[PDB]
Amino acid sequence: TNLISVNSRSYRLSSAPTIVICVDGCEQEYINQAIQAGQAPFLAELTGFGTVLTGDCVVPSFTNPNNLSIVTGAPPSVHGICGNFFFDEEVLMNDAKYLRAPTILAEMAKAGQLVAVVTAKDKLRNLLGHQLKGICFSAEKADQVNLEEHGVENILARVGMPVPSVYSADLSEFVFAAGLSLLTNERPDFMYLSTTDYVQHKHAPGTPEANAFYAMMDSYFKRYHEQGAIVAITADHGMNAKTDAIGRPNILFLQDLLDAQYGAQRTRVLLPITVHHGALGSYATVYLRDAVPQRDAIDFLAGIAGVEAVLTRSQACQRFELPEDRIGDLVVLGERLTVLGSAADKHDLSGLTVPLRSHGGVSEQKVPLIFNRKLVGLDRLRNFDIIDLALNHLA
Amino acid sequence: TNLISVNSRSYRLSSAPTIVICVDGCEQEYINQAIQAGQAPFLAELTGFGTVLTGDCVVPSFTNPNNLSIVTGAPPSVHGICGNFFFDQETQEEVLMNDAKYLRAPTILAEMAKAGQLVAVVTAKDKLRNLLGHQLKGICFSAEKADQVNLEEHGVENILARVGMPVPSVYSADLSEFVFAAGLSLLTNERPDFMYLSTTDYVQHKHAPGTPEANAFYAMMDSYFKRYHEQGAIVAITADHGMNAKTDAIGRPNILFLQDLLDAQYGAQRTRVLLPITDPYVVHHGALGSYATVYLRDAVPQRDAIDFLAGIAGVEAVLTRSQACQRFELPEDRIGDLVVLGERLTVLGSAADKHDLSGLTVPLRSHGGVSEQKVPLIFNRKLVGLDGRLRNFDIIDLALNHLA
Ligand SMILES: [Zn+2]
Ligand SMILES: [Zn+2]
Ligand SMILES: [Zn+2]
Ligand SMILES: [Zn+2]
């Protein structure tokens, strides 16, 4: 068909309705466990006609950076969204204003395709819908969709569900339910769906709660498939326990530690995230005031138990492909079971109602890539290559 | 209060029966999930009176090397057992470390007995019991052969009758349950000063944390932990290594065939791949772990092999003997020219041709690498004098000397 070029990648416009799903916080085990548990029959047999792969997401393994990467088919060094915020002013990249590249989404639309985007959280929806002319809304604000703004109307009635609670599993279901109704009505050419990792943050793979959620998604996949759509599924990042044997969190307050070593006001620990984790992840940035010597800082931090790696700006930028201008002097990586906080005084841990499970580091990098089709031309796979494979590598 | 010193460590003899338990493959998450699920009420309330900590086991995160360090309070560099076997480039043969004849240090257990202490050791597997019973005068037997138990050798008689159970199958949870049960008998009867209990990771290789079956097994242990505690014993719990999934989203295994790989790069026989996770002869899935060692022929340029291997997706790290020894504290004479570590979700095999994966009913769960290094340290008592990097092999020190 018609071929569009976006961010230096060429894409062949879909002939059949294509659905790219981003399963927030999808550590592979979730899937393996549900199947074993017999709670995902569809995925269980998908191997008969499908393709299951494993790819690497973007580091820092956070939702925004990853989602943006998926829809642009590029890394943060291209789209420029490497976290929820940066420094210089503690500015927030919550606006497309911060977007430095186009989405594949907007291009398909410009080429005349009917593109749809559905996300659980409204905030994402903003970033993703940049320059998009089509259907675009969140489950979070389903109640207020209008034709002009969102390309749709009365989705609540259509879906047969009330506005869900942000801190509910219902938020994600809504996403799937909405995607079904659009498929069977409007029949978009391309649809992008994105959930929240609310469940994954609260439950580990293999638990009733987790299995149940997966059982729900599996049903939707089945139905999408039954509709003749092409279904492509991935995740933005993985997920892990960040606790001891009894559920107590393994935290390292970098700000506190740094302040003690070099004296307060001398360093600036930034946590590119913001209840799921109480802003606790395995990745952080550090800004050094002239007073402190990078060499020293590295040695110091690196020797702290729980730190996985200390990278300089250049190191990180090149290794992870990030924008040098929106990253600190140092990049700190947390170990498998460790999260990094700023200062103790600045965190509300009393909100943690269950043992902490988070992401951000390298141990939440492995993510799945699943198709309900067979593929061709397979040569280091990234989660943001999903669209590529879905539009160009079909057998 | 008697003081002894072993392997350069001082230890105060127990005043109360102390029981040190090694829960094989006890990834921390198993405890967390069992508690969250209502299946571990005793452990669930232990914080209020006990102590929960985290340590690093020895890498390779294997069963024998670890258990051995626990009982000697030292690394393999000291006791010598750094795997199931090794390769002697003097004899050009495969050397099986299945005999206490390979031990380079004394066990703390043996010493406590020398000092007049009544010391019991109960393992699930009999093979372990042999290494552990080195120079030990006390009670020592395995559930696996709780059959052939005589007074002269084991220090006990008719344990089956005592426990009220039959001899359990190796490939089962009962195997481990027996251990506990037998430990309860001894405690209530012989009441040893010191006891060491060691299970098998059968269940953990099969079920993930939070699974009905995982939780069940955990609920069983909790029950004994409580009984021991109600008897007044000091209960200290750790693990030999954690456990992880070694598959993809659908449960297919992540396997690297290092022999195959190397052979294709260097040709047949220029390298030798050893998987010390078990005895050299085993070819089943039981032989796949996230650590392997490699012997290079003189012809093969070491740096090159490092680069080659280091470049294969799924290999976390490749280290030379020297680096490996220093870093993990291993005996240089019993490891290969190279040490290969695999990523979190990856295992290392030798040659496809060799392995028999027919036995893998369920998706692969294994260990041996840095991703299975974190382990718990649990005590039913408050502790004091805590000074850097806790090891599982510091358990005895803590349990004997750090009691509050
Ligand atoms: Zn996410
Ligand atoms: Zn999250
Ligand atoms: Zn073990
Ligand atoms: Zn094992």
mmCIF file of C-alpha atoms in Angstrom, chain A residues 27-29 31-33 35-36 43 47 51-54 204-208 239-241 243-248 250 305 335-337 353-355 357 362-366 368 370, chain B residues 27-29 31-33 35-36 43 46-47 52-54 208-212 243-245 247-252 254 343-345 361-363 365 370-374 376 378 388:
data_model
loop_
_atom_site.group_PDB
_atom_site.id
_atom_site.type_symbol
_atom_site.label_atom_id
_atom_site.label_comp_id
_atom_site.label_asym_id
_atom_site.label_seq_id
_atom_site.Cartn_x
_atom_site.Cartn_y
_atom_site.Cartn_z
ATOM 1 C CA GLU A 27 6.817 -8.520 33.292
ATOM 2 C CA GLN A 28 6.790 -11.763 31.292
ATOM 3 C CA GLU A 29 6.043 -13.902 34.303
ATOM 4 C CA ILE A 31 1.804 -14.155 31.334
ATOM 5 C CA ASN A 32 3.605 -17.378 31.962
ATOM 6 C CA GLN A 33 1.844 -17.696 35.311
ATOM 7 C CA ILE A 35 -1.276 -19.614 31.375
ATOM 8 C CA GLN A 36 0.037 -22.166 33.765
ATOM 9 C CA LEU A 43 -2.516 -16.784 24.765
ATOM 10 C CA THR A 47 1.673 -20.206 19.376
ATOM 11 C CA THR A 51 4.672 -15.228 17.301
ATOM 12 C CA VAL A 52 6.080 -14.700 20.802
ATOM 13 C CA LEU A 53 9.238 -12.713 21.212
ATOM 14 C CA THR A 54 11.236 -11.030 23.922
ATOM 15 C CA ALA A 204 3.027 -10.341 41.824
ATOM 16 C CA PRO A 205 2.632 -12.848 38.994
ATOM 17 C CA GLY A 206 0.750 -15.993 39.864
ATOM 18 C CA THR A 207 -1.578 -14.483 42.469
ATOM 19 C CA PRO A 208 -5.358 -14.703 42.031
ATOM 20 C CA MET A 239 8.247 -4.983 37.153
ATOM 21 C CA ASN A 240 9.845 -6.354 40.256
ATOM 22 C CA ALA A 241 9.658 -6.663 44.006
ATOM 23 C CA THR A 243 11.520 -5.532 49.230
ATOM 24 C CA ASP A 244 12.929 -7.882 51.776
ATOM 25 C CA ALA A 245 11.353 -11.184 52.736
ATOM 26 C CA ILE A 246 8.710 -9.574 54.733
ATOM 27 C CA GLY A 247 7.683 -6.843 52.413
ATOM 28 C CA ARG A 248 9.848 -4.043 53.760
ATOM 29 C CA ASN A 250 14.795 -1.609 50.126
ATOM 30 C CA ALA A 305 25.235 -1.368 48.529
ATOM 31 C CA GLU A 335 19.862 -3.244 41.777
ATOM 32 C CA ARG A 336 17.156 -5.868 41.094
ATOM 33 C CA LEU A 337 15.487 -5.441 44.486
ATOM 34 C CA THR A 353 -0.451 -0.455 51.663
ATOM 35 C CA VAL A 354 1.229 -3.492 50.100
ATOM 36 C CA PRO A 355 4.848 -4.434 49.637
ATOM 37 C CA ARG A 357 6.891 -3.490 43.500
ATOM 38 C CA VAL A 362 17.759 -2.646 33.988
ATOM 39 C CA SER A 363 16.057 -5.630 35.736
ATOM 40 C CA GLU A 364 12.643 -4.460 34.359
ATOM 41 C CA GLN A 365 13.981 -4.236 30.791
ATOM 42 C CA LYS A 366 12.964 -7.552 29.368
ATOM 43 C CA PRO A 368 7.359 -9.480 25.591
ATOM 44 C CA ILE A 370 3.336 -10.945 20.920
ATOM 45 C CA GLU B 27 14.099 -16.598 47.000
ATOM 46 C CA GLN B 28 12.884 -13.922 49.356
ATOM 47 C CA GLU B 29 9.704 -13.420 47.457
ATOM 48 C CA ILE B 31 8.222 -15.633 52.073
ATOM 49 C CA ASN B 32 6.659 -12.350 51.197
ATOM 50 C CA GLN B 33 3.926 -13.886 49.085
ATOM 51 C CA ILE B 35 2.599 -14.057 54.225
ATOM 52 C CA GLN B 36 0.515 -11.776 52.057
ATOM 53 C CA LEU B 43 6.612 -15.582 60.113
ATOM 54 C CA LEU B 46 8.068 -12.530 63.729
ATOM 55 C CA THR B 47 9.039 -8.881 63.222
ATOM 56 C CA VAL B 52 14.605 -10.154 59.377
ATOM 57 C CA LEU B 53 17.721 -9.184 57.235
ATOM 58 C CA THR B 54 19.086 -9.670 53.751
ATOM 59 C CA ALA B 208 6.857 -19.685 41.546
ATOM 60 C CA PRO B 209 6.369 -17.580 44.529
ATOM 61 C CA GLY B 210 2.757 -16.898 45.348
ATOM 62 C CA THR B 211 1.499 -20.109 43.798
ATOM 63 C CA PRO B 212 -0.829 -22.378 45.638
ATOM 64 C CA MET B 243 15.528 -18.881 42.390
ATOM 65 C CA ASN B 244 14.294 -17.333 39.113
ATOM 66 C CA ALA B 245 12.250 -17.999 35.987
ATOM 67 C CA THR B 247 11.858 -18.553 30.370
ATOM 68 C CA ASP B 248 9.997 -16.120 28.214
ATOM 69 C CA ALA B 249 6.358 -15.077 28.406
ATOM 70 C CA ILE B 250 5.069 -18.468 27.349
ATOM 71 C CA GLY B 251 7.400 -20.529 29.393
ATOM 72 C CA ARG B 252 9.876 -21.523 26.784
ATOM 73 C CA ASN B 254 16.222 -19.303 27.737
ATOM 74 C CA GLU B 343 21.439 -12.935 32.736
ATOM 75 C CA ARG B 344 18.469 -13.078 35.092
ATOM 76 C CA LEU B 345 16.228 -15.055 32.782
ATOM 77 C CA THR B 361 7.232 -30.728 32.299
ATOM 78 C CA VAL B 362 6.883 -27.235 33.684
ATOM 79 C CA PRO B 363 8.700 -23.997 32.697
ATOM 80 C CA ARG B 365 13.126 -22.099 37.170
ATOM 81 C CA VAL B 370 24.234 -13.150 40.419
ATOM 82 C CA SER B 371 20.392 -12.825 40.085
ATOM 83 C CA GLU B 372 19.910 -15.494 42.695
ATOM 84 C CA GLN B 373 22.407 -13.995 45.130
ATOM 85 C CA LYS B 374 20.040 -12.217 47.516
ATOM 86 C CA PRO B 376 17.098 -13.876 53.708
ATOM 87 C CA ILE B 378 15.659 -14.587 59.806
ATOM 88 C CA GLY B 388 28.655 -3.652 55.675
#
